[PDB]
Every structure is written in structure tokens, then in C-alpha cells.
Write a protein that binds this ligand. Structure first.
Ligand code: FMN
Ligand code: FMN
Ligand code: FMN
Ligand code: FMN
Ligand code: FMN
Ligand code: FMN
Lengths: 190, 190, 190, 190, 190, 190
């Protein structure tokens, strides 16, 4: 057995961003992990991650085109260009913990099994954990990370509040993904 | 923020039982928690929990009647009688992270949203975490615990390997349940 | 073939309680049945059942804790204590003809297969029949009745209006449950 | 309240056909019901129903074309012609307690809510009751019966073993259908 | 390979009726097809189809009884009588691209797999194509057409705007149905 | 109304690749369409598309990483590099007409609404049409195409056999996608 630190935040959400990234990088370095997978909708957390990465490869997972308005991206080109210049990979694809079922539930009614899994992760462990899982599958399916332990970072709405060590998998073998360690999360999710 | 210990086990399953209970009791006492909710199919973990509880109220959650063979219980009367003599509460009811949908998926085919949630908890966090959640809802619905933070304990197949601090909820408000802290779990679930 | 009496009530609901119990007990005694399984939310029907049981074992199935408000019971302690003094068993657990799917349908939308079965029983045969089935599975899963024919009693909202002879089963073998006889029910369910 | 006869058969299935029809006609006449809705796959029960109808209008509900082999009917033309000559209506359409979902569950896997309702009716009340319900909705949707109480007759595999008094409804208002009385059914469904 | 004409209409709906029928009949005759399957709710398109059929057998598929109001038909008797006099077959049965699931989604919430298929056909190819498919399965299940290529015609709300050459199938082998050719459809569905 | 050519192939599959691309490019140029979205698993169809594009922008949609083996890509780096050199965009992301539901149906059983839509497209219109739709949503979600009419190309297993003019949409507004024209498809899908 391994006794490790876990950090619990008093509140969820964006105030926790810098500490989450610090702890994420700290654990990655202890484990010899190479990839830091970070959710960033508009680019703030991505930029902070690059500043703090200390040599880790940063894989930024952003919103699918059309998440807010069809055909539009939340992260603007000038931000994306700077992230790429600083060596980030950018993953932009469908959100795999809802998928096409979101169109059906929104327009016609009734949620799917996938959406139920998403909501149980949100409720039990917080939105940031749900996102950690979701972005890891997306990064894997998009070919941005290998099937090796990575550190994933997500949050509630904006910024970051949760970091995990996770073994990735794909949309066709989701039950092979595994949370190895929880580095930090809000004690209070809501 | 709160920096706490989390213990990761190298293997899942029954070898971790005594350490899981020790750590569960340790955290409950730090937090002023009164109830220890423990999964025990045949009674072994329940008996160990009572020995180690140091004044906590132990709520034992066992298998539903008929889990293996219709009309039969896995925990035998002599064990149940001893647990009750030592002050345990016993919860015996339907397993709420499958429910009647298990009859449908087994006989007719296709899993439900509830069963999908269960499997995602098993795969991401291990069977013991899934059980921690499940038994907490069952204990709440059966009227054995209040809606206050409790420590829940479960494992892979037999014994215990996972302990959490959890805010309970019921079958009709499941998304109000929340994992506040993870005390210990297997690093490797399988 | 066996020609038997069935009693059809003109209206559903609580006005039928005493006659339903009378007919339930009458049929149980004809068949040599030992257990009378009765739904009672607040305790009225349970108390009447005990008065009328004539030596049958009464198994009272009540609401899950949290059915109305989280952490609260509809049947109050003083009633529960009196029922136990008079020899009733009390079953309090999750309602198995909805289960965790009720949280999903209420919060996120869309009903499950289990909830669809429940509604078809309510519509075709009345709420009291649906309850008869539901409480029999619950009583079985909670270990309160054997897998032998029992008489079950339920109603529309309050009291009783339907009684059946039923072969129990569990949440994992629901399709083995069987209605052997319908003793009484409302001709008009609504 | 109304005290009536119900007849319970010792075995399910085809041996009960003549008695089921006799009892069905008897009850229809007591109630002033005009329509007798009868399941007949190959025509035997339909022919017997016409012989025994004593002035009731017989609505025969048969298998959908393709139930056994695509493009083929189980009831042959010579039988259909004789039934029509004797004044029967013939309903031949999709089986509405499975519908298109049967193609999905058979080819791709997983049963629907509709198929789950069907199976619960089969298990709790027997196949003949399930059929009584199903054929009443089909007869209504096909325009063969009005929305008035009718007597419906069905069975296990062949012949008849169950008769009910039922208020019809359609595929779009199924929960308005109601079983008013159960005239006869097998005590033992299987 | 076969180079053929397809006609795209600028608008969906009833304005396209006469041209759709003309093109449908034209293609049927080129292929030696015998049956023209036409959706007609109130009878207008059916009557026009008979006028234009030039010796094809017209199979009219109308609304299920109760589509608007329980127990009522949209096509009135005087129209049905005239269609039959002119040699049409009339199919009136449950709408198989929703079925009983429509009662569940309307009353209780959440759409089925069948309803999701229907909506995807409506959105991708227009309501008229969805109807072409639906009425072909209905006509097959009702025994009105053989399992041979037919031309099917449907539209948006009223009239016709889409015609296809289709290989029929039944509710239990839906995935054997196949669109061989699209004769005409709206370029703009909405 | 617009009378246009549609080409029907006698057989599905890879033999149709060059003609499908020729017809796709022909129609795009007639309409002033700028983007040709092409499915290519291993790269063959992509390379042919670039050769034949005549100035259109080619958006290649390939398999998700892990489609065959976790962590592996079907299109090898040397092919991807050449496609990029020749000006193709490459979309690699989760397959949105199955998504995470594929893990659930494969491991646990039962298909989703999304998978049912996919299968209905495959059966009615052929695998190549299904792919045309799927890759258009993926290309949109990945930010590779605007919400303007595009020509999409897909096939049965390998190569191409179907081309459409399609208005894209995203995973959250799928029912806004629309097939404007079918350029070519197999008359016989299987
Ligand atoms: C693919 C994706 C899915 C997300 N899902 C959720 C969600 O379910 N709940 C939530 O609160 N935030 C969600 N987020 C937000 C992230 O957790 C994170 O707070 C955000 O991307 C950071 O953006 P910023 O760097 O611009 O602040 C999601 C983000 C992404 C990229
Ligand atoms: C309600 C209930 C559900 C359970 N579900 C699972 C499960 O999903 N997977 C698993 O490996 N063990 C499961 N278990 C087993 C428990 O996690 C634990 O290992 C067991 O109850 C301990 O029994 P013992 O004390 O007799 O060893 C379940 C136990 C209970 C009581
Ligand atoms: C587990 C459970 C489920 C019930 N479900 C329903 C229901 O679906 N519809 C309904 O009208 N009543 C339902 N009831 C109410 C019972 O049928 C019965 O009328 C009630 O429990 C009697 O309570 P009383 O004795 O306090 O009057 C349910 C009761 C229980 C205990
Ligand atoms: C629409 C339809 C559905 C049926 N479904 C079932 C069924 O679920 N189970 C069963 O045992 N028989 C089923 N049957 C059979 C009937 O209950 C009845 O036994 C049969 O139609 C009588 O045919 P016969 O007169 O040729 O003997 C069905 C029949 C029809 C027409
Ligand atoms: C079984 C059936 C299902 C139909 N479903 C739809 C539908 O989904 N959307 C729609 O716009 N029209 C639908 N229609 C309407 C038809 O496509 C067609 O426009 C109509 O039946 C023509 O009726 P009329 O001849 O009285 O104008 C449906 C019609 C039938 C008979
Ligand atoms: C995202 C994606 C999904 C696909 N789904 C299917 C499918 O459902 N059925 C099928 O026969 N082919 C499917 N294909 C194969 C394509 O239609 C096409 O034949 C193939 O990608 C061409 O690869 P090649 O250029 O290496 O021959 C799919 C391809 C992709 C990229």
C-alpha cells in the first residue's frame, strides 16, 4: 500500500485552478507521467497549464464546435495559435459523455445511459471529475495521448478544481478506463 | 483547502479488509462521524467492523434475499444473531444500483441506465466504490442512517478494499448523494 | 377448473379497505395461506389488518424513508411500535417498481422499462394491483416472506382496494412472480 | 360492490378453449356487450367463437403477415373466407405490444419498454391475458371495435385460456385502456 | 450502373402532390412495379392516385383509428366507400414507426429507439420519406402488399412530396426493408 | 422543381469508388460547393479524392484511434503525412453515430437510440449513406467544415459507393442536419 496526499477544496470551481494545476504537475512528476490533459473552454486554464507544466506535454481539450452556437468555437483563433506556439496539442471533438444522445434528449426527451453515467459522476464526484474522465476518452479517440497513465484536469464551469491519474480508453472500450489516483477535488461539489 | 491522507492498495479485494476498516474508523473519528456502513454478504467484514468500531454505530448491509437462490439468505441466522447482539443494525433489501432492471437485462436482454451507472463506477473506481455508494442509498431507504455524513465500506467480491465519506440520499433523490472524501481504494481495480 | 368469487368495487380507493381485508383473510384461510402482505403508508391499513387477521401473520410494507421528504418516515414511531407489539413484521425499503430510475426520470427525464411496467399495471388493473405486486417483491427481497403463495393487499393512494393471491419472487427473478387469483379489485380504477 | 364468478383453470393453454369461450359469451350477455374480440392464429378459435357467439359480433385478431415467414399468413385463405361468410370481422396488423422494437431487440439486442410491459403481463397474468390486452388495442387501432366495453379472449400458444371485460384504447392513449373484469384465466400460467 | 432522373422540389408539402404522383407512376411503369402505396389521411391524395394510376394497384394507407380523437377516423365513410369502389385497398392500423412507445413518451416522457429512427428520417430526408417507409411496413404487416418492390408515396402533413422504390419488410424484420431508388423529394424539408 | 441525375450502382462497395468521387466532384462544382468530406479508414479513398478534387478542399474523416486495437490508428503516419502535404484536412475523433453507447452495448448488452438510427440508415440506404451522415457531423464537431452545404462521400467497408449534398450540424443539434440531394448510391445495399 501507498499513502499519498489528496487535497480537498472547500468550494468547487474556478478559484481552485492554480492549486489544482500545481498538484497535478507535482503528482505527474512523482510518477514519471508525461502528459497533462486539461479541459479549457476559452483557453485560460490551458495557458496557465503551459506556464506551470515544467516540461510535461500539455494536451488541451476544448469544446466541440457548436457547443454554444452552431459553427462557432469558444476558444478564439488568437488563443489557439498561442497555445500551439507554446507546444500544446489541441483536441476539439464531440463530447463523448453525451454524444448524439444529447440531441435526442434535448429535442425529443429522455436521457440515455451515457448521460446517466455523466450525471452520476457529476453528482457523486463533481463536475470536474466527470470532465476529467470525458476529456481523457476524447483525447484518446482523437489520437492525442497513448494508452498510458496520464494526469487529467477539469473543473466546475470554468477553470479547474479536480485532477486525477487515469488510464485512458476509447469510446468502444470505455470500461477499460480506470482512475488510479485522485489528486485533488472539491469536498463540496455544490 | 484540506490536505489529507488517502491510501491506495496495490491489489483489489479481500486482503485489504483490516486496513480498510482501520482507516475508515480513523477518518470517522477525525470527522465526528457516528455511523460506519459496511457491506457484508456472509458476515465476515461485519464482524471485523464491530471489533474495530471503537464506539461507532455499525450498519451492516447484506445481500437481498434471493441473490444466489430464491428465498435464501447468504448470511446465516447464527451470524446475524451475533451481529445484532453486538449492536449492529442489519439492512437487507433490494440492491438499488440494479433493481428490477436486472431481471429484464438477465432474462430479456439490454441493460438500463441504472446498471450503466453501476458499471461505470465499477470500472473507473472499482467494485468496492460502487458498493460504497449502493449500500449507502440502501441504508438510507431502509431508514438505518440519517442524512448526515457517514463512512461507507465495500470491496471486490469479499471483504473490504474501499472506504469513503459520503452524504447519503434515497432512490428518489440519488443525485443529492455526494462522495465527500475517498479514504482508501485499490490503485489497481482489476 | 375452480369456480370462485371475485368482488368488484364500484369505486377505487380507501372506502373499500375493510371489505378488501375481509375478503383477503377469507381467501387466505380457504387456501391455508399463512402470510398477509399489506401496504400501509401511515399505518391505518396495517392496524386494521392486524385486527382482522384471525391468526395470519401480517407483513406490513410501508414507504421507503425519504418518499416524501429526505430522511423522514411517513409512519410514525408510535404506530410502528404498536404494530410490532401486535406481531406485525415491518418492511421498509426502496420501492422496487421504480427504483433508482425514478431519480433519473424525475431529474433528467424519460422513464425506464420498470416504470413503464408499473404504469401499465396501474392503468390496466389499478394502482392497488400494482402495489400488490410491488410490495410482494419488496417483502421477498427484505426476507419477510418465503417463496410460497401469500395474499397481498394494496390500494389507490390510501387504504386498500385490491387483494390477490401471489407467488412471490425477487428483484433478480421478477418474471417468476405470478398472480394466482384476484380476490377483489375496483371495476373502475379511475 | 358486485360479487361475480371467476373461473381458474388448472393448466394454461388450448384445453381450456371451449370453456373460455362459453364463459366469455356468458359474461358479455350479462353485461349487454356486443363485441367478442378473439385471438386466432390459424383460425380454430375463431371458428369455435362463431359457433358459440349467440348473436355477438366476433372480431378475430390474427397474426401479422410475416409473423412466421415474411410475406406469409398463418390463417389460410379458405379459413378466412369461411369466417367472413359467417359474419366475422378480421383484424390483421402489426402486434402492438412489441412493434418495431422487436426488430431491434432481435437483431441488435435489448428490449424496449413496450416489450417489458408485454413480458410482465405474460409472467404475472399469463400469455392469454397479455394477448387479450394486445388484440384489443389492435382491434381499436384497425377500426374494428368502438371505445366501449368488449370481451377479449386469448390463450397460451394455441386456443384460448383467458377472457376479460376490457375498455379499449389506441396505441397513442394506451394508458386509457382498462381491464374491468377477469372472466377466467389459468391459476397456473406455466 | 444506372443513371436515372430524380426530382427535387423547392418546398416541402402539399403543392407537390400531383407531380409526385406523376413521377411515382412513371417510375413504377418503367420498372414493371404493380403496387403504388400512398399515404392519405383524409382521402385527397388517395383519390388523386386512383385517377393517375394508369392500371397500378393503389394501396391507400390512412391514419389509425384514434389518431386525432379516440374511436374516430379522419377519412370519412363516403370517401372510403368511393376509394373501394374504384379498386383501392385500404390499410388502417397502428403507425409502426412509433407504436405503443408513443403512449409512453407522451404520458410519461422519453422517446424510444423507434421514435428516434422516425425523427432521423424526418430530419435527414423529410417527413414524406419517413412516411414512405412507415406506410410500406404497415401495408406489409396488414397483408396488402407482397414482398416485392413497390412505389411508396408520402408527404409533409398533407398531400404528397416524396416517392421511393422500396423493398418492403415487416415489424419483426424491419432491417430487411430497403430503399432501392428515390424518385422525388423536397430539396428543402423545412 | 429541379430535375437532376442520380446514379444507382448495381453492387455496394469498393468497386464504385472512382465513379462515386467523379460524380461527387461534378455535383459540388455545379453547386459552387467548396468542401468534399470523404471517409477513409486506411487512406486509399482520401488519396484518390485529392487526385480528383479539381480545387475542392478535401476533408478526410478517418477512424477513431482504437477502432481496431486500443491506442492504434488504421491510417499510417506516412499516408497521413502525404495527405496533409497535398492539402487535406484530417478529422480523427469518436464515431458519433454510436459513441460511448457502443461500449455499453458491446460489453453489457442492448443498443441505444443512436445505434438504432445508425442501423436504420445502414439498412434503408446502405452503409455508405450512414457514413456520409456520420462523418459530416464529426467534421462539423471537429471544426473542419462550416455549416454550409458540403458533399460527403462514404462506402461499404472500403472505398466509396455513396455521395450526398448535406447541410451539416453538430452532436447537440443533429436534427438540423439535412440531406439536400443524393448524388449516387447502390441500388442494392447488400
Ligand atoms: C469537453 C468538455 C466538457 C465539459 N463538461 C462540463 C460539465 O459537465 N460541467 C461543468 O461544470 N463543466 C464542464 N466543462 C468545463 C471544464 O470542466 C472546465 O471548467 C473548462 O473547460 C475550463 O475552461 P477555461 O479554461 O476557459 O476556464 C467541460 C469542458 C469540456 C472541454
Ligand atoms: C448490496 C451489495 C452489493 C454488492 N455488489 C458488489 C459488486 O458489484 N461487485 C463486487 O465485487 N462485490 C459486490 N458486493 C460485495 C461487497 O463489496 C463486499 O465485498 C462483501 O459484501 C463482503 O462480504 P463478506 O463480509 O462476507 O466478505 C456487494 C455487496 C452487497 C451487500
Ligand atoms: C411501496 C408502496 C408503493 C405504493 N405505490 C402506490 C401507487 O403506485 N399508487 C397509489 O395510488 N398508491 C400507492 N401506494 C399506496 C398503497 O397502495 C396504500 O393505499 C397505502 O400504503 C395505504 O396506506 P394507509 O394504510 O396509511 O392508508 C403505495 C404504497 C407503498 C407502501
Ligand atoms: C396478435 C397476437 C399475439 C399473440 N401473442 C402471444 C403470446 O405473447 N404468447 C402466446 O402464448 N400466444 C400468443 N398468441 C396466441 C393467442 O393467444 C392464441 O392462443 C392463438 O392466436 C389462437 O390461435 P388458434 O385459434 O389458431 O389456436 C398471440 C396471438 C395473436 C393473434
Ligand atoms: C401512417 C401515417 C403516418 C404519417 N406520419 C407523418 C409524419 O410523420 N409527418 C408528416 O408531416 N406527415 C405524416 N403523415 C401524413 C402523410 O405523409 C400525407 O401527407 C397524408 O397522409 C396525406 O393525407 P391527404 O391525402 O388527406 O392530404 C402520415 C400519414 C400516415 C397515413
Ligand atoms: C467514421 C467512420 C465510420 C464508418 N462506418 C462504417 C459503417 O457503418 N459501415 C461500413 O460498411 N463502413 C463504414 N466505414 C467505412 C467507410 O464507409 C469507407 O468505406 C472507408 O472509410 C474507406 O476507407 P479506405 O479509403 O481506406 O478504403 C466507416 C468509416 C469511418 C471513417
Amino acid at each position: 500500500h501507498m499513502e499519498k496526499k489528496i487535497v480537498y477544496f472547500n468550494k468547487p470551481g474556478r478559484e481552485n485552478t492554480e492549486e489544482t494545476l500545481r498538484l497535478a504537475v507535482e503528482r505527474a512528476k512523482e510518477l514519471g507521467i508525461k502528459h497533462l490533459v486539461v479541459a479549457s473552454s476559452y483557453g485560460d486554464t490551458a495557458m496557465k497549464a503551459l506556464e506551470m507544466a515544467e516540461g510535461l506535454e500539455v494536451v488541451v481539450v476544448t469544446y466541440h464546435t457548436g457547443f454554444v452556437r452552431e459553427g462557432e468555437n469558444t476558444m478564439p483563433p488568437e488563443v489557439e495559435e498561442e497555445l500551439r506556439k507554446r507546444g500544446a496539442k489541441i483536441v476539439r471533438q464531440s463530447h463523448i459523455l453525451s454524444g448524439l444522445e444529447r440531441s435526442i434528449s434535448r429535442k425529443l426527451g429522455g436521457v440515455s445511459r451515457t448521460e446517466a453515467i455523466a450525471e452520476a459522476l457529476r453528482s457523486l464526484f463533481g463536475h470536474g471529475l466527470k470532465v476529467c474522465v470525458e476529456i481523457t476518452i476524447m483525447a484518446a479517440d482523437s489520437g492525442a495521448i497513448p494508452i498510458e497513465e496520464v494526469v487529467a484536469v477539469g473543473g466546475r464551469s470554468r477553470g479547474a478544481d479536480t485532477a486525477v491519474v487515469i488510464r485512458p480508453a476509447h469510446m468502444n472500450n470505455f470500461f477499460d478506463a480506470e482512475i488510479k489516483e485522485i489528486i485533488c477535488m472539491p469536498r463540496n461539489k455544490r
